[PDB]
Amino acid sequence: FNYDQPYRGQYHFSPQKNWMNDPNGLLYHNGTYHLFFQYNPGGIEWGNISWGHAISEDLTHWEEKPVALLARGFGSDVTEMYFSGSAVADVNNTSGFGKDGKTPLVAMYTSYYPVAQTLPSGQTVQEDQQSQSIAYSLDDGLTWTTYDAANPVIPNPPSPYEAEYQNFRDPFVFWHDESQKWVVVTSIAELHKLAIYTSDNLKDWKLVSEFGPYNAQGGVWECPGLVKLPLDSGNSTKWVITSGLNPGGPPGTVGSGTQYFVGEFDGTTFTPDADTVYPGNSTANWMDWGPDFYAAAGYNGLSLNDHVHIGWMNNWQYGANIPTYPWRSAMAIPRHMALKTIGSKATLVQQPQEAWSSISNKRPIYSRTFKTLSEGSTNTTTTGETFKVDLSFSAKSKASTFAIALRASANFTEQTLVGYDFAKQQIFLDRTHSGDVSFDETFASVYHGPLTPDSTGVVKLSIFVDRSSVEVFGGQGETTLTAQIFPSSDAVHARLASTGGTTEDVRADIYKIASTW
Numbered sequence: 001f002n003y004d005q006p007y008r009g010q011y012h013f014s015p016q017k018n019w020m021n022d023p024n025g026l027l028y029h030n031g032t033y034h035l036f037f038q039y040n041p042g043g044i045e046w047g048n049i050s051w052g053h054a055i056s057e058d059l060t061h062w063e064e065k066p067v068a069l070l071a072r073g074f075g076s077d078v079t080e081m082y083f084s085g086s087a088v089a090d091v092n093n094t095s096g097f098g099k100d101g102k103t104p105l106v107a108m109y110t111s112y113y114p115v116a117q118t119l120p121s122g123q124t125v126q127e128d129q130q131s132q133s134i135a136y137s138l139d140d141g142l143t144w145t146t147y148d149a150a151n152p153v154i155p156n157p158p159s160p161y162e163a164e165y166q167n168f169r170d171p172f173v174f175w176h177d178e179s180q181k182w183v184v185v186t187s188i189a190e191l192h193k194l195a196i197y198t199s200d201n202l203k204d205w206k207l208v209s210e211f212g213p214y215n216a217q218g219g220v221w222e223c224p225g226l227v228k229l230p231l232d233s234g235n236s237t238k239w240v241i242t243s244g245l246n247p248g249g250p251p252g253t254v255g256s257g258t259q260y261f262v263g264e265f266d267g268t269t270f271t272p273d274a275d276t277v278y279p280g281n282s283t284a285n286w287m288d289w290g291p292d293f294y295a296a297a298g299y300n301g302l303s304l305n306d307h308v309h310i311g312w313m314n315n316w317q318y319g320a321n322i323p324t325y326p327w328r329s330a331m332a333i334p335r336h337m338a339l340k341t342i343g344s345k346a347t348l349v350q351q352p353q354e355a356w357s358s359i360s361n362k363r364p365i366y367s368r369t370f371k372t373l374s375e376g377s378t379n380t381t382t383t384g385e386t387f388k389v390d391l392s393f394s395a396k397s398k399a400s401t402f403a404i405a406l407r408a409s410a411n412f413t414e415q416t417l418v419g420y421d422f423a424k425q426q427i428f429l430d431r432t433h434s435g436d437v438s439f440d441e442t443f444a445s446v447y448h449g450p451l452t453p454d455s456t457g458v459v460k461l462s463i464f465v466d467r468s469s470v471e472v473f474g475g476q477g478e479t480t481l482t483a484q485i486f487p488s489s490d491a492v493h494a495r496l497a498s499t500g501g502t503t504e505d506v507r508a509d510i511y512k513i514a515s516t517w
């Protein structure tokens with residue numbers, strides 16, 4: 001397939017054609033990273049929701065595969081859609097789906113039923129019901145069989161939330177080694193609370209606890225996850241819940257976004273640390289301070305120091321309207337997950353997880369150092385559309401702001417600015433003049449996230465630009481900002497900008513990135 005379209009991320013996953021949303025079924029198994037995703041096999045907007053499927057060996061070079069779970073009744077009246085969920089390798093055959101020595105992969109997902117019906121299990125479902133169901137694969141995730149005999153395995157929200165039958169979704173299931181049980185986290189979306197169940201067999205589930213609401217509550221809760229992450233460089237660990245909400249994303253944004261909670265998990269209950277939850281319903285721990293990072297899900301099948309989340313690089317506010325063709329939506333750079341103690345508190349730090357040496361050389365295409373970068377702009381350099389920029393500079397700078405102008409037209413009237421506000425100690429990403437901003441009133445905006453300098457007073461930014469995206473990793477990765485952009489074909493220039501004064505101890509390096517397709 002030819003992936004050379006305007007706006008087509010060359011190192012971000014997108015389907016060849018049609019609509020994609022949430023990542024699903026993230027599983028590393030037998031040297032393969034599976035990427036399933038909410039997918040419309042019949043169109044460029046949301047609908048006919050199925051699990052699409054791609055694979056890679058390195059989170060970088062994706063190969064799209066046949067649809068894994070195809071909306072039941074696709075091509076006519078749809079009777080069941082395959083909403084979001086997760087996947088595991090049932091290596092001990094606890095589910096009994098194994099056959100001829102081959103052990104099964106098992107997906108757990110929300111069945112969405114557009115019509116009232118009686119299912120092959122004998123269960124009866126209401127119009128627009130959401131329930132949790134399972135499927136299995138005996139060919140390493142290539143084809144799938146739905147558990148028609150018993151689905152759904154969790155028909156109803158727990159008492160007293162039976163009225164929430166239409167909003168009960170996004171099961172994240174995993175093996176909990178310590179309690180020797182399967183654990184699943186689901187979202188009672190409208191009530192901003194998660195319900196946790198355990199099982200010995202992936203089929204029979206027992207309600208064990210509920211979590212929330214805490215912190216951000218300005219939208220429905222979706223895509224819960226729970227994982228144990230290393231803290232700093234010793235032996236200590238913490239458990240982390242990631243969950244999205246739509247709308248009510250990070251400050252300065254309108255629409256969806258991803259928050260997190262740091263705490264402990266005993267196999268049944270997640271206890272948030274006292275300092276991870278804040279009075280009220282607004283203040284939160286943001287996984288990403290930008291507008292385009294949602295439905296972030298974690299990989300099953302990875303060890304303590306190797307955890308990876310994948311997020312959807314779009315926003316529900318305007319996601320239907322981005323000017324992409326023949327596909328719509330991409331996933332963000334996969335995110336390595338860990339904790340570091342920053343300012344006396346356990347803080348999520350992400351690292352851009354792709355096989356960068358396979359597509360990007362360590363010889364920079366552009367390299368400069370300035371003991372004192374003059375006020376104003378440097379001369380133009382050409383970057384093309386796909387590149388990484390590393391910047392470092394002194395927090396002691398005299399300037400108001402230091403920034404790079406990215407994906408800019410020759411005269412820089414079109415450009416995306418990524419920079420640092422010295423007084424406020426904030427990264428900013430200004431996409432107000434980034435290109436096509438015509439499709440939503442809230443798109444042409446400036447975004448901000450907190451970033452303190454390191455111990456030596458050095459501020460570091462690592463910036464990834466692809467055909468329709470900028471991702472900023474600040475510091476050690478404690479602050480990320482993810483934003484789509486839609487620049488014109490000539491928008492391949494860059495320069496540095498020191499506003500209000502000079503910038504001290506500047507290092508800028510730009511590295512070309514090649515296509516993964």
Ligand SMILES: *[C@@H]1O[C@H](CO)[C@@H](O[C@@H]2O[C@H](CO)[C@@H](O[C@@H]3O[C@H](CO[C@H]4O[C@H](CO)[C@@H](O)[C@H](O[C@H]5O[C@H](CO)[C@@H](O)[C@H](O)[C@@H]5O)[C@@H]4O)[C@@H](O)[C@H](O)[C@@H]3O)[C@H](O)[C@H]2NC(C)=O)[C@H](O)[C@H]1NC(C)=O
Pocket residue numbers: 040041042043044045046047048074075076
């Ligand atoms: C969910 O997916 C379905 C696909 O299964 C999407 O529906 C399709 O939408 C596209 C537009 O993107 C339509 O494409 C048009 O097709 C025109 C010709 O249509 C006739 O010929 C088709 C091939 O034989 C045939 O399938 C189609 O039948 C459909 O419409 C009939 C009404 O006339 C109806 O009686 C049938 O039941 C059936 O629904 C027609 O006879 C062509 O002239 C256009 O150029 C254009 O390509 C498809 O026809 C749609 N396919 C179907 C099966 O309906 C749907 O949009 C998706 N939903 C969402 C929300 O995205």
Ligand SMILES: *[C@@H]1O[C@H](CO)[C@@H](O[C@@H]2O[C@H](CO)[C@@H](O)[C@H](O)[C@H]2NC(C)=O)[C@H](O)[C@H]1NC(C)=O
Pocket residue numbers: 089090091092175177178180
């Ligand atoms: C599959 O079965 C194996 C063996 O019964 C389980 O591995 C055990 O895990 C416990 C706790 O982590 C260890 O103390 C044991 O040493 C392990 N057993 C052996 C012999 O290796 C495993 O937890 C089961 N589940 C999955 C999904 O792998």
Ligand SMILES: *[C@@H]1O[C@H](CO)[C@@H](O)[C@H](O)[C@H]1NC(C)=O
Pocket residue numbers: 217218281
């Ligand atoms: C958040 O709190 C405000 C009061 O500060 C209240 O008006 C609003 O209803 C709350 N939001 C939710 C979802 O409870």
Ligand SMILES: *[C@@H]1O[C@H](CO)[C@@H](O)[C@H](O)[C@H]1NC(C)=O
Pocket residue numbers: 379380
């Ligand atoms: C930028 O560099 C070009 C090519 O080296 C040069 O012609 C120009 O004078 C430089 N500065 C200006 C004025 O933009």
Ligand SMILES: *[C@@H]1O[C@H](CO)[C@@H](O)[C@H](O)[C@H]1NC(C)=O
Pocket residue numbers: 409410411412413490
């Ligand atoms: C900048 O260049 C573009 C053409 O690429 C043009 O449309 C625009 O008017 C120019 N802006 C100014 C103020 O020169």
